[PDB]
């Protein structure tokens, strides 16, 4: 049954027919909804072949040439390759199309209005961790573009049956070290304690600051990962200050410009790309609310509240809310002043509503994960709160994969 | 490991498995292919007897007498009653147990820590619209208790073979009118436009303010509903003021004290109580964020922001967020000053986390609808954001039911 999807602010209704194209089960059943789970529980040539055919069909339909010579000859090449070898290879233009489609299909992404504007670097000719690093540096330099951020992805060689994966061990290309104490507390970013510890153990000389940028651990197939320090000139950061509260800069807070996620698997036509780091730009709430105010991240709410002289002794003063707002304001202000691309959660959700509408017209639906699309402050103040959404898995897709250690 | 959903808290790192969901006998709207958890309203002799036997089994476990001789004699009496009459009837203590359990089972209610403290008024002897009114007045008086609110439900007679239902037409016992204007806008609460116009069709003389309390339309079996005006002294209201912004009082905003929901069906052991109004107290975001700030509700955000002198011409000022926070603060401050029970969103979510722990031990789980439990401002600042939840239907249950017209 095709779901009816209602917007409760406007009264409008659509029907999602794209979901019938899903060949891939999520975590829910009629007995119970597991839509709030962050990760999946779990984490043959005929099956590869049908995923391949389907993807090649998606590709040819996208260039309008769907039935042509070229199309039927490509299907046969894929077929011949699979049958003889158990696997196949994409053409670069197919890869480019598949990478954009993976982004488009990602239900947790509120930035998808931008899905067609993606620079794709083909790095499938990579044979060593040293070469990975070179490609990574060019990606960063390109994507960063002195603050005028440009969306990008770099695709390293696919998984192959007989061998280890290319992997980037770090979860993003820029991460701040998290240093555990003998007394259990963390200095820096508690989300990165484990990667920090792996880095030291592979020979990194640690720092002891709150915002020490980590080296990368890059792994070529079946080899120990190697360590590469990013040149500081490549890592653009933004000092945080507040437009009217002058002590705020005194807090010594900063964040990096480029969100470049480096641990997700890209799946295109049944092929799997274990190292395919991608980047866009930040939505301010990711920094201002989560990364700075999460209790298990930098957890700065209390410090900010005290500096604002708020009554911290009682939840009902809404001290937490008030301090969060000002931190988000600082991030927006500081990024604007530094001429580094960023989008606020109001503008982002308004763009995503436009996206839903474009996708309704173009494909009869849009898979979206409401819990992830609605921002972590001011939820009901954004239009996406009032929008019903259908979550399902289309391919090409970005997926999670096991940590390689 | 365990063959049951694994549930993680990402703030604390802790894991539980929900075994309770095994007890669900009713499908929700999700399938492996697509998740529909964000939809608001997704769309009998042996059947009754099986629901009835299960509910009686639940009652007998709750008083620890399962397999007892009184347990088996009650089961026989329910078979016999259904046998000869097509239906059966609950003992008083079974109704009290069922009502509390429907509350405990409600996945969308963040206030469930209070589930065992529910006063159950048995109004199953009611035989007229006028008597419903008296019962409802008494409910309102007991529950309001001059500001020190007490949770309560009043249960009118069950649906019965052939005979018409008891219904309260109004969605809550207190509703402000919504008067559709010539210019297409609404004075009052836009949520209540259809109920307002029903009231006037049924002979109410409408006012023209923004906070006109509506009459009730009450319907006894096989009759036209009858209109009843609540005496104003029974309807406690709280004028909104802000603790430091002295002009806020001048806006003339107010809200009523008692959230008393009146259009839900209470289902117990396959019996159906079509009128069973219940009340608790408010969480402050219901008033300050949704009712006052939804665009399709009082929509006051821009007005408040202009009084605060914010820059409303750009999203990135965070004007909506700053206004909403102040409006929520005024709600909390005003209810406090007036001594009317209210709970803020931090204290409510903290208590709900306690609830989850209590239910993990008492029954192996707790059905919860993450999108509804997480408050509409300051989401990730509350501990429930970071908590995975499993949503499923257990009975006894409160259910939506179609409007009586
Ligand atoms: C151009 C600006 C972009 C913005 C503002 C943006 C925004 C976001 C946000 C806010 C999230 C949620 C992140 C979190 O809470 O952890 C997200 C998730 C994601 N976005 Fe984007 N996006 C952008 C570009 C991209 C690009 C370039 C890709 C891939 C090519 C992408 C793929 C994803 C994926 C796969 C997720 C899910 C991540 C996960 O499950 O952990 N987005 N997006
Ligand atoms: C004691 C104080 C209580 C608090 C603070 C409270 C809080 C809430 C809130 C905030 C919601 C969501 C409402 C909305 O967003 O529309 C809710 C939903 C609900 N609560 Fe409560 N609750 C309380 C008591 C009650 C009681 C006494 C009952 C029944 C006996 C109840 C049953 C429900 C149900 C059925 C819903 C779901 C409503 C729907 O689907 O529209 N709760 N609760
Ligand atoms: N601005 C952007 C754009 C794309 C992004 C893609 C992914 C991410 C990060 N999401 C990680 C979510 C997560 C954190 C920790 C554990 C986990 F399973 C999942 C952030 C993004 N931000
Ligand atoms: N504080 C309380 C306690 C119990 C409540 C029980 C129910 C409600 C109202 N929720 C109605 C949600 C709703 C609005 C509009 C359409 C719809 F289907 C559902 C509010 C409550 N607030
Ligand atoms: C448990 C819950 O699903 C989890 O905390 C999710 C909620 N929504 C989110 N939304 C975004 N955008 N990013 C997140 O990490 C999460 N976390
Ligand atoms: C589309 C979405 O499900 C809808 O707006 C929901 C989201 N969460 C909610 N949560 C609560 N508590 N109350 C609501 O009305 C809603 N609305
Ligand atoms: Zn689901």
Short mmCIF file of C-alpha atoms in Angstrom, two decimals, chain B residues 186-387:
data_model
loop_
_atom_site.label_atom_id
_atom_site.label_comp_id
_atom_site.label_asym_id
_atom_site.label_seq_id
_atom_site.Cartn_x
_atom_site.Cartn_y
_atom_site.Cartn_z
CA UNK B 186 -8.86 33.08 12.11
CA UNK B 187 -9.49 34.85 15.39
CA UNK B 188 -8.77 32.47 18.28
CA UNK B 189 -7.40 28.98 17.98
CA UNK B 190 -7.31 27.71 14.36
CA UNK B 191 -7.24 24.15 15.64
CA UNK B 192 -10.83 24.58 16.87
CA UNK B 193 -12.48 26.02 13.85
CA UNK B 194 -14.64 23.00 13.01
CA UNK B 195 -15.73 22.46 16.62
CA UNK B 196 -16.51 26.15 16.95
CA UNK B 197 -18.76 26.10 13.93
CA UNK B 198 -20.49 22.88 15.12
CA UNK B 199 -21.24 24.69 18.42
CA UNK B 200 -22.85 27.60 16.57
CA UNK B 201 -24.78 25.20 14.33
CA UNK B 202 -26.12 23.67 17.56
CA UNK B 203 -27.28 26.93 18.97
CA UNK B 204 -24.28 28.45 20.75
CA UNK B 205 -24.09 32.24 20.60
CA UNK B 206 -20.53 32.87 19.55
CA UNK B 207 -18.32 35.56 21.00
CA UNK B 208 -15.45 37.23 19.19
CA UNK B 209 -12.34 37.11 21.31
CA UNK B 210 -9.12 35.19 20.96
CA UNK B 211 -9.66 33.14 24.11
CA UNK B 212 -13.37 32.41 24.25
CA UNK B 213 -13.88 29.12 26.12
CA UNK B 214 -16.16 26.79 24.05
CA UNK B 215 -19.21 24.97 25.28
CA UNK B 216 -19.31 21.25 25.29
CA UNK B 217 -21.29 19.15 22.95
CA UNK B 218 -22.29 15.96 24.65
CA UNK B 219 -24.04 13.07 23.19
CA UNK B 220 -25.87 10.32 24.89
CA UNK B 221 -26.90 7.20 22.92
CA UNK B 222 -29.09 7.74 19.91
CA UNK B 223 -29.55 11.44 20.55
CA UNK B 224 -28.40 14.66 19.02
CA UNK B 225 -25.63 16.11 21.09
CA UNK B 226 -26.67 18.80 23.63
CA UNK B 227 -24.80 21.94 24.35
CA UNK B 228 -23.53 22.82 27.83
CA UNK B 229 -21.66 25.97 28.96
CA UNK B 230 -18.96 25.45 31.55
CA UNK B 231 -19.35 27.83 34.49
CA UNK B 232 -16.43 30.18 34.20
CA UNK B 233 -15.39 29.66 37.76
CA UNK B 234 -14.63 25.99 36.97
CA UNK B 235 -12.17 26.84 34.21
CA UNK B 236 -8.98 27.98 35.77
CA UNK B 237 -6.84 30.17 33.46
CA UNK B 238 -3.41 31.67 33.79
CA UNK B 239 -2.65 35.10 32.30
CA UNK B 240 0.82 35.04 30.77
CA UNK B 241 3.52 37.32 32.03
CA UNK B 242 7.30 37.20 31.60
CA UNK B 243 9.71 37.53 34.48
CA UNK B 244 11.83 40.30 33.13
CA UNK B 245 10.18 41.51 29.91
CA UNK B 246 7.55 43.75 31.46
CA UNK B 247 5.62 44.32 28.17
CA UNK B 248 4.86 40.67 27.75
CA UNK B 249 1.82 40.89 30.11
CA UNK B 250 0.42 43.59 27.79
CA UNK B 251 0.08 41.06 24.97
CA UNK B 252 -2.93 39.67 26.81
CA UNK B 253 -2.01 36.06 26.28
CA UNK B 254 -3.34 33.29 28.51
CA UNK B 255 -3.80 29.55 28.71
CA UNK B 256 -6.04 27.23 30.73
CA UNK B 257 -4.70 25.04 33.46
CA UNK B 258 -6.25 21.63 32.73
CA UNK B 259 -5.34 19.55 29.78
CA UNK B 260 -8.32 17.26 29.63
CA UNK B 261 -8.53 15.14 26.53
CA UNK B 262 -11.98 14.01 25.62
CA UNK B 263 -12.16 12.41 22.13
CA UNK B 264 -10.09 9.23 22.63
CA UNK B 265 -11.45 5.76 22.96
CA UNK B 266 -10.28 3.70 25.97
CA UNK B 267 -10.10 0.04 25.01
CA UNK B 268 -9.91 -2.57 27.72
CA UNK B 269 -10.19 -6.33 27.08
CA UNK B 270 -11.87 -5.68 23.76
CA UNK B 271 -14.48 -3.45 25.47
CA UNK B 272 -14.69 0.05 24.08
CA UNK B 273 -15.25 3.18 26.12
CA UNK B 274 -16.02 5.83 23.50
CA UNK B 275 -16.31 8.58 26.16
CA UNK B 276 -13.60 8.47 28.77
CA UNK B 277 -12.15 11.93 29.25
CA UNK B 278 -8.89 12.13 31.08
CA UNK B 279 -6.61 14.87 32.41
CA UNK B 280 -3.17 15.38 33.84
CA UNK B 281 -1.16 18.60 33.80
CA UNK B 282 0.72 20.41 31.11
CA UNK B 283 4.29 20.16 29.96
CA UNK B 284 5.22 23.68 29.27
CA UNK B 285 6.28 23.27 25.65
CA UNK B 286 2.72 22.12 24.75
CA UNK B 287 1.57 25.69 25.52
CA UNK B 288 4.60 27.82 24.92
CA UNK B 289 5.97 26.13 21.79
CA UNK B 290 3.17 24.24 19.98
CA UNK B 291 -0.10 26.02 20.95
CA UNK B 292 1.35 29.55 20.89
CA UNK B 293 4.05 29.23 18.28
CA UNK B 294 2.87 26.71 15.63
CA UNK B 295 2.24 28.62 12.42
CA UNK B 296 -1.19 27.03 12.15
CA UNK B 297 -1.99 27.75 15.81
CA UNK B 298 -1.78 31.21 17.56
CA UNK B 299 1.39 31.83 15.57
CA UNK B 300 2.75 34.56 17.92
CA UNK B 301 6.47 34.16 17.28
CA UNK B 302 6.90 37.17 14.97
CA UNK B 303 4.92 39.47 17.28
CA UNK B 304 7.03 38.52 20.26
CA UNK B 305 10.22 38.85 18.25
CA UNK B 306 9.26 42.35 17.08
CA UNK B 307 8.56 43.35 20.78
CA UNK B 308 12.01 41.92 21.64
CA UNK B 309 13.37 44.06 18.79
CA UNK B 310 15.03 41.06 16.97
CA UNK B 311 16.01 40.96 13.32
CA UNK B 312 13.12 39.07 11.81
CA UNK B 313 14.20 39.60 8.22
CA UNK B 314 16.94 36.91 8.37
CA UNK B 315 16.87 33.31 9.60
CA UNK B 316 20.44 33.53 10.90
CA UNK B 317 19.61 35.95 13.72
CA UNK B 318 17.90 33.00 15.41
CA UNK B 319 14.97 35.23 16.13
CA UNK B 320 12.53 32.42 16.19
CA UNK B 321 14.57 30.48 18.64
CA UNK B 322 15.10 33.41 21.01
CA UNK B 323 11.42 34.32 20.98
CA UNK B 324 10.26 30.79 21.56
CA UNK B 325 12.51 30.44 24.53
CA UNK B 326 11.12 33.56 26.08
CA UNK B 327 7.57 32.50 25.44
CA UNK B 328 8.22 29.13 27.08
CA UNK B 329 9.78 30.97 30.01
CA UNK B 330 6.70 33.17 30.42
CA UNK B 331 4.51 30.08 30.45
CA UNK B 332 6.59 28.46 33.22
CA UNK B 333 6.90 31.67 35.22
CA UNK B 334 3.21 32.46 34.95
CA UNK B 335 2.01 29.00 35.99
CA UNK B 336 4.52 29.07 38.92
CA UNK B 337 3.34 32.49 40.09
CA UNK B 338 -0.28 31.43 39.83
CA UNK B 339 0.50 28.10 41.67
CA UNK B 340 -0.84 25.89 38.96
CA UNK B 341 1.05 22.65 38.40
CA UNK B 342 3.10 22.57 35.19
CA UNK B 343 6.30 20.74 34.26
CA UNK B 344 9.09 21.96 32.08
CA UNK B 345 10.56 19.87 29.31
CA UNK B 346 13.84 19.09 31.10
CA UNK B 347 12.19 17.87 34.29
CA UNK B 348 9.60 15.94 32.27
CA UNK B 349 12.20 14.13 30.15
CA UNK B 350 14.41 13.40 33.15
CA UNK B 351 11.38 11.80 34.83
CA UNK B 352 10.58 9.84 31.64
CA UNK B 353 14.14 8.38 31.71
CA UNK B 354 13.44 7.23 35.26
CA UNK B 355 10.25 5.71 33.95
CA UNK B 356 12.05 3.78 31.23
CA UNK B 357 14.39 2.30 33.87
CA UNK B 358 11.48 1.42 36.17
CA UNK B 359 9.64 -0.30 33.32
CA UNK B 360 12.75 -2.08 32.10
CA UNK B 361 12.81 -3.89 35.43
CA UNK B 362 8.97 -4.26 35.86
CA UNK B 363 8.08 -5.54 32.41
CA UNK B 364 11.25 -5.75 30.21
CA UNK B 365 10.52 -2.64 28.11
CA UNK B 366 8.46 0.42 27.46
CA UNK B 367 6.76 1.30 24.17
CA UNK B 368 7.70 4.83 23.25
CA UNK B 369 7.35 7.03 20.15
CA UNK B 370 10.61 8.98 19.97
CA UNK B 371 9.29 11.77 17.73
CA UNK B 372 6.54 12.54 20.25
CA UNK B 373 8.53 12.08 23.41
CA UNK B 374 11.37 14.42 22.35
CA UNK B 375 10.16 17.99 23.03
CA UNK B 376 9.60 20.47 20.23
CA UNK B 377 12.32 22.93 21.37
CA UNK B 378 15.74 21.99 22.75
CA UNK B 379 15.48 18.35 21.66
CA UNK B 380 19.11 17.24 22.12
CA UNK B 381 19.44 19.22 25.33
CA UNK B 382 17.03 16.58 26.85
CA UNK B 383 18.21 13.08 27.81
CA UNK B 384 15.45 11.40 25.70
CA UNK B 385 16.99 12.57 22.44
CA UNK B 386 20.02 10.30 23.04
CA UNK B 387 17.80 7.29 23.90
#
